[PDB]
Design a protein around this nucleic acid. Structure first.
Ligand SMILES: [Mg+2]
Ligand SMILES: [Zn+2]
Ligand SMILES: [Zn+2]
Ligand SMILES: [Zn+2]
Lengths: 568, 83, 104, 191, 145, 99, 570, 97
DNA sequence: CGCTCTGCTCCTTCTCCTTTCCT
DNA sequence: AGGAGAAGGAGCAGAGCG
């Protein structure tokens, strides 16, 4: 037997109580910044919006100075937001928030650098790879940067063009935007500010009714919100300027940051390619690989247009968001494309020659065949506006991507019988056990065992039906549902918790084994630790580094797993 | 927390019944645990009665700390308080 | 007697002993061997998380004796420090309250 | 030796009320800090002076005077630039332990930092040089490089019971030195 | 119970003998009580204040250690019988030879009267000064005994 | 005990403690209601408000933040019963002295 | 070696209430209660290794050992175990709190049904520098009404109806919560209603009998579904619900039964054997939990399994409080003594053992009058004065009298009963041991427990105790008979009438208690009632008629009669 | 005294007592203790009922003042001392640097 | 202009709490 | 019992609507 004392050390029952959001954010900021940043971030996440005096009163550290330093560091890493508001009765009190998108840069850093390296297509030139890697690394590690700072951070009398021509190339592909106050401002607070000043300048006792006034304010603030949101995302005027006898060079004064939205869209493109590779041929998916990369730059925003976070959803009129999503995703002129466009950007390696059998040189008639294959597939990979016109229906492809990833996680963890039963109950509606036996053809004992193993997660819901006034469990007949929202909700929290657990374990290992990293720093760890003898020390270093690499690999796989559930 | 100075004290100068009973009990404890006394004993063994005699002769070496509701205090001795 | 009840699929031998493993048993397919791509990704992840910690924005900390001899003299200083004041800050991005701690 | 500054709480029993206040304060202080190590400051020897004494306060059941007091004690704690003599008593094949004169013998000076040409001779020979050796109960000199402390005692009651049934950390104040430069080892090497 | 100040002025090995000797003089002096003195005080036959065993033992060990010959030589120490005026008037040469440290306490008790001892008293002692202010310190700090 | 036959102590009830409070007698309440009825020594942790045993915390396995004090055995029993439901009456301690 | 140690006196400052997070319950344990068998019977009723009476949690008699800190029934404080459950279950103490948490959050994404400005205003109102329980309760209730008024999640736009609890009876279907999603949508078409009708169309085609039961079938919240929802509630909105999320276990999910702590055997001792209700109930808990766990993997009937899960609910519910008014649901079967029953009533913990106790050094006998007894004095029988000792410490002023008492010994009234040396621990009984040499070796710090003598301060009491003059402090006076005697003047404060009246005597055992008793409750200091300020201790019937007959105008006395009267008076 | 007519019942007694221990001592014990557990009621032990329950000293009557014993200690015999000491340390480098 | 929400105001059903104890 | 407290219903003027 294992005693309860041994349980608290080996098993992670101590960490099974911590909240997944607080655990993961706190671990990330503790890994990358430290204990004060973790304290402030934990307090913000646990309590919400706070002021500096409230932070001092809450955290044991009563040194305002320490709080101010922690807040400036957290703002430079844009892990926090601020809202400086003024009370009508007197003075003004600022307030602070925790930035979900700021921490996710630390959570995604290696993947971000990977994407920026691979998309510049600098695999030809070695120095280009090092240059873009250094640019993106320094930007992420510094929070925000300027071209002047980067150019003065290099030896003079050199070819500044070589280190600046790709910078504009970075800015032109959407992997770099300028930073403004909207990034540090809460979206719902901005929507509250914009909804007023349109419900206030209304004439007194106007002929328009109160409902009409509120609707008028809504659709007159939506336009301003859209303008302010779209301004920093896509306005290339900074890179459009051009000093005389020079190339296209960005404005020195503007300060640049990473554009998380573009990276998220790239991740969605990757997920779509990987899911497409499982329903058609590699040749067909090879074209899909370049079709998605062409529309990626102009693709719609992924997590939200920022308008669901901005307000109450509606009385019943999220249809006014669904319809606009369809309208954009189709009527975008860049998004619409034909079989002619795909010819030019087609890979040189691809042949397309014998991939097709009709009746059972990069020709445009070959592409149309595979695009018709994509449209014919059960998954709406592509849809046609007019014969010869093509577009990707995100509004209908994201639910199927989510459901497929979910059911395959179920298959890989629980039984294939569990996957079959989950799909059976989902396809059906409110199916009873006798009918489950009828349309699933599996023994009732096994069906019950798998159903129980499935209810431990939010995957199968029970719908009771009572036959007596007192809802006895003997006289009631029990049904089943699936409730896709609950199931996706549980799945993302589980993966978030497990990422938090892995990062915590890595930090614990480094804590225990820093006694060798001290000597490593003493003796120039890279390549020389063999010369310091201590073969036990070298072996311990080896296995701890192996554990670190494995931790990072499993973390990246967990990231790919929870990405689709993080979508909406 | 601080102490109200000797020159300005706003509390009564008359010892109370509670202060008297507490002083007698504390001194009786001190004597019963073999403390030196300061009055001629005559024939007596009880620490309580020795303490009563000492109080009547005004020879008890203790002072009283009076706590106001805010949290400051004043120091009154037994040779100052009267009854 | 509270021991009379018994389900059909259960015998007296199976019941009567509460045993919940409390240790996990259903793994995830993400813990297989490593790949070269994931290896290089881990390397860059290691370079990150390290560069920032050795950088200026740390805020991490939450025999320096008084006796003076020649050992303290000409002693190699361990590090050249950095402060919040050094890094160039764009003043618009920061609220007015925090200007005091940064070097104006 | 150094001087410290420590605040404390001292309880004076009614038996000692006849004595002087300082003469009883010093007595309870000497009881508390007679020959003991105060953690992370060294080993206290003797109370030297007395600087602050509050007014004695009484709790509702004891009848004694509880007094806050600050004082400056005499503590033994050399750091690096020190030199201490003595003679060696007990040696083992893990390093050499030199003793003081009845104060403490919890100082451990390693053999590896002892000069250069020295090694342990299990042939009952005191030491080996490539050309003179010392032995038990002879004058020596040395230094201390780093001073370490240990204050561990997480003995659960079951651990206590099992240890008692089956039946180490003697030193809570451990020092480590070296014997590199000439002059140490023994002063009677010369003249 | 809190320790306020880690270290006050360095209680050099000059007063650490006077204070302990005065303590022994005040109570439990064994230089003449070994003659079977039977002075009765307080009527208990104890005849001594502060029968305290622990303090007496440690103070005897310190006074014995500082009475044994200071081990720069192989029969007093040279500090146990140190005149008070000597400690205040031999300061002149120590201060004039600017060692640029606080090792004044190191020499007043340990390793006079030798060259190697004076050399190992401080680091690079030859390099800092080797012309006239080695023999001068030896002949001053060794002139007491 | 309370038996007519055993050495049954006499009960000092609610009305009687009310009378004694009305007289303003604190030490007599202490004597009659703790010392001479059920006075028990307990060990309580200082970082968590939980009673230990034998100088051992048994929740944070340290034995470094344990404080001894006397409380009624009925209070000890009530605290252990409260912990037996899902109630955790953490005890906070303060120094008696230090002004 | 020999490190310094310190001991600073400490005072209780304040209680702080919470719940255990199921990690504290496991940190709190020494063993896990796994089996159902109390005794292994291989060693003549020796307790099982992992049962309800496992010795690791203490012993019930003084002939055993507790296996954690080896000590008998005396020296063992007691140790806890834990009891993991196969299926999550509700906590009846926190049932209405669980209802209140559900009514304030979304049942799809678990976001609080408030607006950012609204919740900011409520938060500002909660953290005002002067706020007590009444204001806090008012603000929280207002928050509850506001979120009950909200109709659609601001984050996910779902639908939320009333979240009442299924009310069917005290015992049966009591702990069932129903969500009525489609109560606030009337004469309207919503996607939720369309999905509901689409789902229900299929079932009726296959099963045409549930047409009667198309109504009802609300969104039921079983304990596991409710637990999975609570794990997603954000931390930032815990304050609006009534929970401090700063500390671990500050979480709505820690109010659901997932680990039961196993109480120490001190709390549930085995009498001379017979067990008790708490132990029996927890054996039944282990039984039903094991049944659930074994049946879950065997694929037993879902209809059968939910009937057992409901039974485990009522089992842990009746172990915390006996409130199942209809126990007919239990096939085996409300006089059982649960945890709640051990704290309530006139004879519970608070009103029986904490605020009011039973004390040592006390007596009770009939009372009789005594005119020659001074007021301020009470007359104690010698027989009870020889058992009600007072512990006198040897203090250089009473050594001779104390050794004379030791020599006299318990047989004679001016004697002592026990001796307690300074260094020693146990009291030396003086009934044996040649007390002559003990009296010689008596030192100046020992404690002698001597018989009650003349002048000892005692308390005297009559029941019922209406006003504060029902208990007064007297002076003792040893006398040859068996009753308690008092002067008839001081009968008025007690309301005594020597017709069989009995009174209680208490002997304070400390110097401070003695001095306060005599100086504040003494008869001479309580001649006046404090309700009016009028005399209460004065003459009585004969003491008044005799005075009147003396001072009548017809009474003339010569010198012999005068002087005899004066001598009688003194 | 709190702006409204609060009676002497159990419902009124939740006026300003704010003490879970004494409210449980009075009436509706388990409801009060469970509410204190849920809302994390954090009472202080100052009332006479809590003082009795925990076996502490009341704050009224004889427990409303502090007894203090004058130490009767002079002040001029508390000065720091070290004889013929400070001639060396500080002055060793009080010139040329 | 009936219609249709949102909100009171009224009402019914459902538990708690009742004296000294006297060994 | 009586005696208040509290949680859920049930009809109803109110206010906005095309
Ligand atoms: Mg009568
Ligand atoms: Zn603890
Ligand atoms: Zn035990
Ligand atoms: Zn929602």
């Amino acid at each position: 037997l294992v005693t309860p004392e041994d349980v608290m050390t080996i098993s992670s029952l101590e960490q099974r109580t911590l909240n997944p959001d607080l655990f993961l954010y706190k671990e990330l900021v503790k890994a990358h910044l430290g204990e004060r940043a973790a304290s402030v971030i934990g307090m913000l996440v646990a309590l919400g919006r706070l002021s500096v005096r409230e932070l001092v009163e809450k955290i044991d550290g009563m040194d305002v100075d320490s709080v101010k330093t922690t807040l400036v560091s957290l703002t430079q890493l844009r892990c926090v937001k601020y809202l400086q508001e003024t009370a009508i009765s007197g003075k003004k009190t600022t307030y602070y928030y925790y930035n979900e998108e700021g921490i996710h840069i630390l959570l995604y850093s290696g993947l971000i650098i990977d994407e920026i390296i691979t998309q510049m297509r600098v695999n030809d030139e070695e120095e280009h790879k090092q240059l873009v890697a250094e640019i993106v690394q320094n930007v992420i590690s510094l929070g925000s940067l300027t071209v002047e700072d980067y150019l003065s951070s290099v030896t003079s009398d050199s070819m500044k063009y070589t280190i600046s021509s790709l910078f504009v190339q970075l800015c032109e592909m959407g992997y770099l935007i300028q930073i403004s106050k909207l990034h540090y401002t809460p979206i719902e607070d901005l929507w509250q500010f914009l909804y007023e000043k349109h419900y206030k300048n209304i004439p007194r006792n106007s002929p328009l009714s109160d409902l009409k006034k509120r609707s008028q304010a809504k659709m007159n603030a939506k336009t301003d919100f859209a303008k302010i949101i779209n301004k920093p995302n896509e306005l290339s005027q900074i890179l459009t300027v051009d000093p005389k006898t020079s190339l296209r060079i960005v404005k020195p004064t503007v300060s640049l940051t990473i554009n998380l939205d573009r990276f998220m869209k790239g991740r969605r493109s990757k997920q779509l390619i990987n899911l497409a590779k499982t329903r058609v041929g590699s040749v067909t998916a090879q074209v899909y690989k370049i079709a998605l990369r062409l529309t990626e730059q102009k693709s719609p925003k992924i997590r939200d247009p920022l308008t669901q976070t901005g307000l109450l959803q509606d009385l019943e009129e999220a249809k006014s968001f669904q319809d606009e999503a369809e309208l954009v995703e189709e009527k975008t002129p860049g998004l619409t494309f034909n079989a002619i466009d795909l010819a030019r950007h087609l890979p040189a390696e691809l042949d397309l020659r014998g991939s097709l059998l009709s009746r059972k040189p990069h020709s445009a008639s070959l592409i149309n065949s595979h695009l018709k294959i994509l449209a014919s597939s059960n998954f709406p990979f592509l849809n046609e506006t007019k014969p010869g016109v093509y577009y990707v229906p995100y509004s209908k492809l994201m639910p199927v991507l989510k459901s497929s990833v979910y059911e395959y996680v179920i298959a890989s963890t629980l039984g294939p019988s569990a996957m079959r039963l989950s799909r059976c109950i989902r396809d059906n509606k409110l199916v009873s056990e006798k009918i489950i036996n009828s349309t699933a053809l599996m023994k009732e004992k096994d069906i019950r065992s798998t159903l129980a193993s499935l209810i431990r997660y939010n995957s199968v819901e029970i719908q009771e039906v009572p036959r007596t006034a007192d809802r006895s469990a003997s006289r009631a007949v029990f049904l089943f549902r699936c409730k896709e929202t609950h199931s996706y909700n549980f799945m993302r929290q589980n993966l978030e918790w497990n990422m938090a657990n892995l990062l915590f374990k890595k930090e614990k290992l480094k804590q225990e084994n820093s006694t060798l990293l001290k000597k490593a720093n003493r003796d120039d760890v890279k390549g020389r630790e063999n010369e310091l003898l201590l073969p036990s020390e070298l072996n311990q270093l080896k296995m701890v580094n192996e554990r670190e690499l494995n931790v990072f690999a499993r973390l990246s796989r967990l990231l790919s797993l929870w990405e689709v559930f993080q979508m909406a | 927390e601080k102490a109200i100075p000797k020159d300005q004290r706003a509390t009564t100068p008359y010892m109370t019944k509670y202060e008297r009973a507490r002083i007698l009990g504390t001194r009786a404890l001190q004597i019963s645990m073999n403390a030196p006394v300061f009055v001629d004993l005559e024939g007596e063994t009880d620490p309580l009665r020795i303490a009563m005699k000492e109080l009547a002769e005004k020879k008890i070496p203790l002072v009283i700390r009076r706590y106001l509701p805010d949290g400051s205090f004043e120091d009154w001795s037994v040779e100052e308080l009267i009854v | 007697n509270y021991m009379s009840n018994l389900p059909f699929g259960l015998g007296y031998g199976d019941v009567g002993k509460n045993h919940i493993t409390e240790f996990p048993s259903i793994p995830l397919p993400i813990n297989g061997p490593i790949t070269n791509k994931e290896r290089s990704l881990a390397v860059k992840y290691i370079n990150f998380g390290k560069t920032v910690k050795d950088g200026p924005f740390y805020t991490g900390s939450m025999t320096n004796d008084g006796i003076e001899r020649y050992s303290d003299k000409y002693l190699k200083k361990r590090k050249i420090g950095i402060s919040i004041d050094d890094h160039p800050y764009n003043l618009n991005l920061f609220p007015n309250e925090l200007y005091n701690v940064m070097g104006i | 030796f150094i001087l410290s500054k420590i605040a404390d709480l001292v309880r004076i029993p009614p038996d000692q009320f006849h004595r002087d206040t300082i003469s009883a304060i010093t007595h309870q202080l000497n009881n508390k800090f007679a020959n003991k190590i105060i953690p992370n400051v060294g080993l206290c020897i003797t109370i030297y002076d007395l600087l602050t004494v509050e007014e004695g306060q009484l709790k509702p059941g004891d009848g004694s005077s509880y007094i806050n007091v600050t004082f400056r004690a005499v503590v033994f704690k050399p750091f690096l630039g020190e030199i201490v003599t003595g003679w060696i008593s007990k040696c083992t094949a893990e390093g050499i332990k030199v003793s003081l004169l009845g104060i403490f013998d919890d100082i451990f000076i390693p053999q590896n930092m002892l000069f250069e040409g020295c090694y342990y001779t299990p042939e009952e020979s005191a030491w080996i040089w490539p050309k003179l050796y010392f032995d038990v109960n002879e004058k020596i000199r040395f230094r201390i490089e780093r001073e370490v402390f240990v204050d561990v005692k997480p003995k659960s009651p079951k651990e206590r019971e099992l240890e008692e049934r089956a039946q180490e950390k003697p030193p809570a104040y451990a020092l480590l030195g070296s014997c590199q430069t000439d002059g140490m080892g023994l002063v009677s090497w010369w003249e | 119970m809190k320790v306020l100040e880690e270290r006050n002025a360095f209680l050099s090995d000059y007063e650490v003998l006077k204070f302990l000797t005065d303590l022994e003089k005040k109570h439990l002096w064994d230089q003449k009580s070994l003659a079977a003195l039977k002075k009765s005080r307080s009527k208990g036959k104890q005849n001594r204040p502060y029968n305290h065993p622990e303090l007496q033992g440690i103070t005897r060990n310190v006074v014995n250690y500082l009475s044994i010959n200071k081990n720069f030589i192989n029969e007093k120490s040279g500090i146990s019988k140190m005149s008070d005026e000597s400690f205040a008037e031999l300061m002149t040469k120590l201060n004039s030879f600017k060692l640029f440290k606080a090792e004044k306490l190191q020499i007043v008790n340990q390793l006079p009267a030798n060259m190697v001892h004076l050399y190992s008293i401080v680091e690079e002692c030859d390099a800092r000064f080797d012309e006239k202010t080695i023999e001068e310190m030896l002949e001053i700090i060794s002139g007491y005994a | 005990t309370e038996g007519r036959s055993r050495d049954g102590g006499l009960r000092l009830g609610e009305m009687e403690r009310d009378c004694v409070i009305a007289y303003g007698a604190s030490q007599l309440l202490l004597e009659r209601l703790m010392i001479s009825s059920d006075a028990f020594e307990v060990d309580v942790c200082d970082k968590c408000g939980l009673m230990g045993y034998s100088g051992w915390c048994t929740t944070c396995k340290s034995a470094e933040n344990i404080i001894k004090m006397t409380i009624p055995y009925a209070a000890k029993l009530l605290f252990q019963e409260l912990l037996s439901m899902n109630i955790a009456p953490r005890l906070r301690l303060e120094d008696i002295f230090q002004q | 070696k020999e490190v310094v140690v310190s001991e600073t006196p400490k005072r209780i400052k304040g209680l702080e209430f919470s719940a255990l997070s199921a990690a504290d319950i496991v940190a709190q344990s020494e063993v896990e209660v796994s089996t159902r068998d109390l005794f292994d019977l291989e060693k003549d009723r020796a307790p099982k290794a992992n049962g309800a009476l496992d010795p690791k949690m203490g012993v019930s008699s003084s002939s055993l050992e507790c296996a954690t800190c080896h000590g008998n029934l005396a020296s063992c404080h007691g140790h806890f175990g834990h009891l993991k459950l196969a299926l999550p279950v509700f906590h009846i103490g926190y049932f209405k709190a669980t209802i209140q948490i559900l009514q304030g959050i979304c049942k799809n994404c678990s976001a609080i049904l408030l607006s950012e400005t609204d919740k900011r205003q409520f938060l500002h109102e909660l953290r005002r520098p002067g706020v007590d329980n009444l204001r806090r309760m008012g603000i929280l209730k207002k928050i509850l009404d506001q979120c009950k008024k909200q109709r659609r999640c601001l984050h996910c736009g779902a639908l939320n109806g009333v979240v009442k609890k299924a009310a069917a009876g005290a015992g049966s279907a009591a702990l069932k919560i129903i969500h009525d999603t489609f109560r606030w949508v009337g004469k309207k078409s919503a996607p939720e209603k369309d999905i509901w009708v689409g789902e229900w169309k299929e079932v009726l085609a296959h099963n045409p009998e549930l047409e009667r039961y198309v109504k009802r079938c609300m969104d039921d919240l079983n304990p596991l579904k409710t637990l999975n929802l609570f794990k997603q509630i954000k931390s930032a909105d815990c304050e609006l619900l009534g929970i401090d999320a700063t500390v671990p276990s500050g979480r709505p999910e820690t109010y659901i039964w997932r680990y039961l702590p196993a109480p120490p055997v001190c709390i549930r001792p085995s009498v001379m054997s017979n067990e008790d209700d708490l132990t029996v109930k927890l054996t039944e808990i282990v039984w039903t939990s094991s049944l659930i766990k074994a049946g879950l993997d065997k694929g037993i009937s879902i209809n059968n399994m939910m009937e057992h899960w409901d039974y485990l609910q009522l089992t842990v519910a009746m172990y915390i409080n006996s409130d199942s008014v209809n126990p007919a649901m239990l096939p085996g079967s409300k006089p059982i003594r649960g945890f709640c029953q051990r704290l309530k009533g006139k004879q519970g913990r608070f009103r029986g053992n904490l605020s009011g106790k039973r004390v040592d050094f006390s007596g009770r006998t009939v009372i009789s009058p005594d005119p020659n007894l001074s007021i301020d004095e009470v007359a104690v029988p010698d027989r009870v004065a020889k058992v009600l000792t007072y512990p006198e410490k040897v203090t250089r002023y009473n050594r001779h009298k104390l050794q004379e008492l030791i020599v006299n010994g318990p047989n004679v009234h001016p004697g002592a009963n026990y001796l307690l040396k300074r260094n020693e621990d146990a009291r030396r009984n003086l009934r044996y041991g040649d007390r002559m040499k003990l009296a010689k070796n008596l030192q100046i710090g020992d404690v002698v427990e001597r018989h009650l003598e003349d002048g000892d301060v005692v308390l005297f009491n009559r029941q019922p105790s209406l006003h504060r003059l029902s208990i007064l402090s007297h002076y003792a006076k040893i006398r040859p008979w068996r009753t308690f005697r008092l002067n008839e003047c001081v009968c008025t404060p007690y309301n005594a009438d020597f017709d069989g009246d009995e009174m209680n005597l208490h002997v304070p055992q400390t110097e401070e208690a003695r001095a306060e008793a005599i100086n504040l409750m003494g008869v001479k200091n309580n001649l006046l009632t404090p309700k009016s300020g009028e005399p209460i201790i004065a003459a009585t019937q004969d003491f008044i008629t005799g005075s009147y007959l003396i001072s009548h105008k017809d009474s003339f006395y010569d010198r012999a009669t005068l002087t005899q009267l004066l001598s009688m008076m003194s | 005294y709190k702006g409204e007519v609060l009676g002497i019942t159990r419902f009124g007694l939740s006026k300003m007592r704010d003490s879970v221990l004494q409210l449980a001592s009075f009436e509706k014990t388990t409801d009060h203790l469970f509410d204190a557990a849920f809302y994390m009621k954090k009472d202080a032990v100052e009332g006479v009922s809590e003082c009795i329950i925990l076996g502490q000293t009341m704050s009224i009557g004889t427990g409303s003042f502090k007894v203090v014993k004058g130490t009767n200690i002079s002040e001029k015999d508390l000065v720091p001392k070290r004889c013929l000491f400070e001639s060396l340390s500080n002055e060793a480098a009080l010139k040329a640097n």
